[PDB]
Amino acid sequence: GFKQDIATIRGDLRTYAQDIFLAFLNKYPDERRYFKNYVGKSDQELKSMAKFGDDTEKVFNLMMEVADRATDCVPLASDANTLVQMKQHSSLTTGNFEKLFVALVEYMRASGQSFDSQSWDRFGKNLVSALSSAGMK
Amino acid sequence: GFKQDIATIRGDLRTYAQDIFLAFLNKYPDERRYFKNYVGKSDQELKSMAKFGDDTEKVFNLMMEVADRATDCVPLASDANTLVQMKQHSSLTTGNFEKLFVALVEYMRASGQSFDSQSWDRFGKNLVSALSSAGMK
Ligand code: HEM
Ligand code: HEM
Ligand SMILES: Oc1ccc(Br)cc1
Ligand SMILES: Oc1ccc(Br)cc1
Numbered sequence: 001g002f003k004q005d006i007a008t009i010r011g012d013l014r015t016y017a018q019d020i021f022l023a024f025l026n027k028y029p030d031e032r033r034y035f036k037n038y039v040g041k042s043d044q045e046l047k048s049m050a051k052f053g054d055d056t057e058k059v060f061n062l063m064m065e066v067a068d069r070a071t072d073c074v075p076l077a078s079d080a081n082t083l084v085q086m087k088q089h090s091s092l093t094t095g096n097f098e099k100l101f102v103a104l105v106e107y108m109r110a111s112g113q114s115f116d117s118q119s120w121d122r123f124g125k126n127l128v129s130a131l132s133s134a135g136m137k
Numbered sequence: 138g139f140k141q142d143i144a145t146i147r148g149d150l151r152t153y154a155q156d157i158f159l160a161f162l163n164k165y166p167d168e169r170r171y172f173k174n175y176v177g178k179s180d181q182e183l184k185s186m187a188k189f190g191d192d193t194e195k196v197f198n199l200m201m202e203v204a205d206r207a208t209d210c211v212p213l214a215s216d217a218n219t220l221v222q223m224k225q226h227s228s229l230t231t232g233n234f235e236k237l238f239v240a241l242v243e244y245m246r247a248s249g250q251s252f253d254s255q256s257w258d259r260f261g262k263n264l265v266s267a268l269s270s271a272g273m274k
Pocket of ligand 3: 056
């Protein structure tokens, strides 16, 4: 279930974080614009930038922390608040997050690893709702 | 995105090259008049024509290099000059290339693989513009 998925992802965070982020960018190529440094680089090329592996892991580490602190896939208001107030997220809207979760769930469904994909869909939905409440456009 | 798509195509080039060129010929059957002995044949007949596979592979080998040498989907002027000055391209105009890229983009959108189709559309347009600049009518 959801709890085990957090363990699965944490167990090999570098791989999962990189592969899910790439699935996001590949499904929604216009989102690459937010990451100027990743423009004009292939999937295999990106893994060689110290920043890429390190920065993607940091993103998915926090995602896992928000996921683990949730109750029944409902994130804490304080965690939603953190995500909105973050300076690196100043120009984002809830749609950016919606797209990430659509790509994340699609990745899980396509994988050979057994994920509670329905739960991640619901978590994504609840997070987006909590993000709007914390003032994200 | 675009740079990954190049790697994707290169990973199974002959298959992609034949399937995209076939999509082109089937969308624009009168375009066969630039080629020798393609008329009167089904897709499978063409894929068993030794020259068809060899030549179509060579077209896409070069197209991938032109894409790879590009910056932000803008090809090198010298790459465009080569395509204009090639003896095998003496009967061509920019509309021939426009048609090829319409078909390629349509193929990418229809495929189950995550191509950045909009970028290929831009690449096609920028290449046509560069062909024009290099003297193609
Ligand atoms: C639940 C989902 C998300 C979490 C947990 C999260 C978390 C983070 C974290 C921890 C960082 C700092 C990483 C570091 O530099 O150490 C960061 C930065 C950043 N975030 Fe997010 N984020 C999320 C969603 C998104 C989305 C959907 C976008 C837009 C596509 C986005 C855009 C950015 C950008 C552009 C940076 C700066 C990093 C860079 O560009 O190099 N984030 N985020
Ligand atoms: C970016 C697009 C294109 C690239 C990179 C390209 C490149 C090439 C290359 C490398 C060859 C040599 C093939 C060989 O001899 O093995 C070739 C030949 C040829 N090209 Fe193109 N070409 C492009 C577009 C087109 C288009 C749109 C047409 C016609 C609608 C066309 C018509 C031909 C013909 C008739 C030949 C020689 C005979 C044949 O290969 O069947 N090309 N081209
Ligand atoms: O650096 C980043 C990696 C992944 C996301 Br999602 C956002 C920022
Ligand atoms: O021989 C050729 C194969 C494919 C194209 Br497109 C053009 C020429």
